[PDB]
């Protein structure tokens, strides 16, 4: 039974470990996107 | 009983691992691509 607690106990945590890694991500890519959009502006202002 | 939680457990882990892969090379790739059209009207404001 400790080692059906155990595996249970990680298995979960590995959940929980995904949960915070993935939102990492996605969010992060939205605002990098938005970061180079609005560098097409500054860039094309001086070109110009 | 016991090793078919220890089994669930690497499943679990092999689904969460592959879900995060997909997540951080697209935005990764796309964050890579759009700086690089940074660089180029940069570099050719540089030129004239």
Same mark, same amino acid.
């Given at each position: 039974?400790?080692?059906?607690?155990?595996?249970? *106990? +990680? =298995?979960?945590? $590995?959940? &929980? $470990?995904?949960? %915070?890694?993935? =939102?990492?991500? $996605? $969010?992060?890519? &939205?605002? *990098?996107?938005?970061?180079? %959009? =609005?560098? &097409? *502006?500054? +860039?094309?202002?001086?070109?110009?």
């Amino acid at each position: 039974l400790s080692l059906q607690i155990d595996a249970a *106990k +990680v =298995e979960a945590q $590995n959940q &929980l $470990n995904a949960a %915070r890694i993935a =939102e990492i991500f $996605n $969010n992060m890519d &939205l605002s *990098k996107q938005s970061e180079f %959009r =609005e560098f &097409l *502006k500054t +860039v094309a202002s001086f070109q110009q």
